[PDB]
């Protein structure tokens with residue numbers, strides 16, 4: 001009976017705390033290791049890694065290939081980066097949790113730097129959020145910090161990882177807390193709007209892109225702080241419908257003479273009620289329909305082409321038009337332009353970031369010709385310096401947008 | 407050390423085999439009890455209960471109400487059934503697994519009858535039960551359990567779907583069914599029947615299309631595999647094939663009357679299918695007037711936004727649509743006013759299984775609503791003149807079934 005109990009104990013232990021796919025700790029293992037680390041010392045850092053490319057693999061090539069990639073990333077992650085008291089677990093379907101005790105901020109960065117380099121050799125599309133615990137924090141607090149840091153990494157892909165320290169003065173909220181605050185901001189009309197003009201070299205204004213923000217108790221919140229929570233909760237269409245209503249009100253006032261570019265989140269386009277909503281509202285404001293440009297992220301066209309085409313049809317049937325926002329980020333998978341024929345393409349802002357890389361300049365010219373050959377206006381994005389402005393000039397970009405154009 | 411070892415083992419067992427929401431065994435616990443029961447005896451029955459209304463609750467009222475309903479049904483299940491060695495587990499998000507050892511068929515049926523009446527007290531579900539009469543593996547029983555559940559859904563007049571383990575019917579897993587359908591599509595193994603829906607004076611309103619296929623002498627009807635196609639998000643592939651084959655028949659200028667094509671619910675919630683129907687109809691505008699798309703009532707009440715996009719695309723191209731299983735959700739029947747379907751095909755539960763009086767009033771009311779809105783009412787699956795005369799007493803316009811054609 002000894003052999004029964006001893007081996008039954010290990011199988012029960014692995015059933016309770018081990019995820020069969022990744023062969024790492026499961027979510028319950030992670031919370032146990034997290035709660036014990038906090039109650040004893042709480043000195044160290046915590047990190048979360050999301051493998052969105054594994055999510056894209058699951059429906060594309062089935063789950064046999066998806067499970068194999070989870071195991072591969074798990075095997076590659078765990079055999080590398082071995083330190084004392086290191087907890088590595090699979091806390092959800094597409095994200096991994098990591099606990100690094102007895103490490104200060106600089107030590108976590110080298111571990112986080114080693115994580116990312118550990119995922120470049122193994123598939124060649126991920127996001128890494130890391131937080132350092134420098135105050136006494138509860139377990140829900142660190143998970144909220146971990147989630148907001150992950151949103152920071154996604155919203156700024158030029159960062160290798162998103163870093164937030166537990167002592168930060170920044171407002172950190174959970175997903176449902178962000179949604180409640182946005183609903184509060186929508187209800188009380190706390191929103192403010194900015195209009196950035198996209199101008200040609202001749203001063204002709206193509207359109208003015210609308211940026212949404214809101215303020216509560218003297219604190220200002222921008223869209224990249226809460227948009228991850230709304231899309232994860234399938235509530236971003238509430239936010240987009242409010243912005244579209246407010247923008248159309250301004251056009252109905254006969255004030256703005258030029259077209260306005262409204263950003264649309266991906267989670268809103270995959271909502272069929274939002275696709276019906278656009279047709280119903282655009283038909284009630286046909287006079288201003290020609291002055292509305294809907295800015296659709298490139299991720300929509302390549303990941304949700306059918307939802308996007310339904311949205312694009314509704315937009316154009318009502319006398320409006322649309323463009324692409326992160327144009328060029330998904331290079332070698334950018335043939336959707338030929339099918340969709342957008343009115344414009346707004347370049348990925350990472351093109352103004354790495355001018356010196358010769359391979360970056362080759363991709364930039366190639367996607368520039370493709371749009372113009374089809375008669376599609378190209379727009380450079382987030383241009384800050386005359387150096388960026390002059391370097392983008394060699395790629396025959398028609399109109400420019402950013403702080404240097406004012 | 408003895409009491410300590412028992413606590414460590416019990417807590418380890420609790421983390422491994424307890425579902426925190428339902429406070430029942432989880433899936434791993436159920437597979438363990440099933441694999442042990444099979445390897446020990448294998449005598450008895452096995453059952454699956456799917457609470458589709460709980461899936462409606464999670465999006466409707468959040469997860470706090472969804473967790474509470476799972477616990478309520480879980481407490482209801484364990485306290486009501488009072489027999490030995492009964493495993494009650496939550497094997498998936500919205501379905502419960504039950505093992506009933508040492509029971510013959512009549513005992514399984516009274517236990518299955520006790521389950522459903524146990525869920526009528528507190529609150530839309532399906533119960534599938536199989537009796538083990540063979541030496542069967544675990545995957546076999548799960549496949550039988552899934553096909554029995556599909557039998558219960560495709561025949562809602564049954565309280566539960568019953569399959570014997572020794573049945574001659576072809577029992578396949580979800581991916582196996584999907585493989586067989588794709589094989590039939592590739593080789594054009596499909597056959598079609600056209601059943602006419604006629605008015606009281608013989609005018610044919612349309613002809614509904616029924617799809618089936620044969621593989622080396624075995625015939626398969628749609629209700630055997632459609633459940634596996636709607637799961638795995640693959641039913642639109644089958645519907646597109648049927649639509650393609652029907653349009654080829656209409657192009658030949660033979661059929662003077664419209665054809666009613668059934669569309670699965672999982673196909674309309676696929677946006678690629680909504681795009682496909684517009685492109686296909688735009689290439690065959692001449693025959694679009696001869697196309698009626700029969701949409702299940704569950705689409706209009708559970709997936710109204712997808713259905714509105716599909717209905718608009720269908721009518722924009724010169725086709726039309728109607729409602730299938732009309733009256734099954736009598737308590738949510740204002741979609742008719744918004745959608746204005748060309749016809750409503752009554753739930754076949756109104757022709758058969760309809761002498762309890764409360765159901766006879768619902769038939770009259772939903773018939774008035776359709777006629778007042780100028781919508782054609784069609785009785786379904788009419789077999790006898792007795793039914794035919796009785797449906798006329800509810801002023802039904804046109805009739806369909808074996809007795810008319």
Ligand SMILES: Nc1nc2c(ncn2[C@@H]2O[C@@H]3COP(=O)(O)O[C@H]4[C@@H](O)[C@H](n5cnc6c(=O)[nH]c(N)nc65)O[C@@H]4COP(=O)(O)O[C@H]3[C@H]2O)c(=O)[nH]1
Pocket residue numbers: 091092095139140143144145146147150173174175176177469473
């Ligand atoms: N029965 C049931 N209870 C639920 C469910 N969702 C949340 N609860 C609870 O709601 C609290 C707030 O969750 P959140 O708004 O999504 O805000 C979350 C979320 O922003 C983040 N977070 C937690 N887990 C994860 C994760 O696995 N991945 C990512 N990226 N963020 C997470 O930390 C914050 C708080 O985490 P929690 O401590 O777990 O605190 C959560 C959780 O205890 C559910 O689906 N079913």
Ligand SMILES: Nc1nc2c(ncn2[C@@H]2O[C@@H]3COP(=O)(O)O[C@H]4[C@@H](O)[C@H](n5cnc6c(=O)[nH]c(N)nc65)O[C@@H]4COP(=O)(O)O[C@H]3[C@H]2O)c(=O)[nH]1
Pocket residue numbers: 210211212213222223224227240243262263264265325349381382383384401402403404
């Ligand atoms: N270093 C530098 N930065 C510049 C420059 N020009 C603009 N930025 C800012 O970069 C973002 C450009 O908008 P986005 O890339 O489409 O990315 C947007 C956009 O995806 C989203 N967003 C903003 N407003 C909305 C909205 O109203 N609706 C939706 N669905 N998303 C919005 O949040 C993101 C951030 O918007 P903002 O915080 O206001 O930040 C804006 C803009 O203020 C520049 O020249 N140099």
Ligand SMILES: Nc1nc2c(ncn2[C@@H]2O[C@@H]3COP(=O)(O)O[C@H]4[C@@H](O)[C@H](n5cnc6c(=O)[nH]c(N)nc65)O[C@@H]4COP(=O)(O)O[C@H]3[C@H]2O)c(=O)[nH]1
Pocket residue numbers: 063067454497498501544545546548549551552555578579580581582
């Ligand atoms: N690693 C991995 N493997 C997967 C996954 N999905 C399916 N499989 C594998 O493929 C086999 C076929 O499952 P199925 O085709 O959907 O066909 C299923 C299905 O028709 C039926 N059925 C099975 N489980 C359930 C269930 O939990 N609920 C309901 N309603 N029906 C079930 O039993 C058949 C499968 O028996 P299984 O022993 O479970 O054997 C499964 C399982 O080993 C997955 O997501 N990840």
Ligand SMILES: Nc1nc2c(ncn2[C@@H]2O[C@@H]3COP(=O)(O)O[C@H]4[C@@H](O)[C@H](n5cnc6c(=O)[nH]c(N)nc65)O[C@@H]4COP(=O)(O)O[C@H]3[C@H]2O)c(=O)[nH]1
Pocket residue numbers: 601615616617618627628629632645648667668669670730786787788789806807808809
């Ligand atoms: N006792 C009796 N039975 C009758 C009578 N008339 C028809 N039945 C049959 O009942 C079903 C009526 O079709 P349904 O209610 O829409 O229910 C259909 C329908 O929902 C689906 N189905 C059949 N063909 C197709 C198809 O081509 N595409 C899709 N998406 N579903 C189909 O499978 C289900 C079963 O169709 P079938 O097995 O061929 O069985 C058909 C029909 O042959 C009658 O007078 N008396």
Ligand SMILES: [Mg+2]
Pocket residue numbers: 209263295325
């Ligand atoms: Mg933009």
Ligand SMILES: [Mg+2]
Pocket residue numbers: 614668700730
């Ligand atoms: Mg039908």
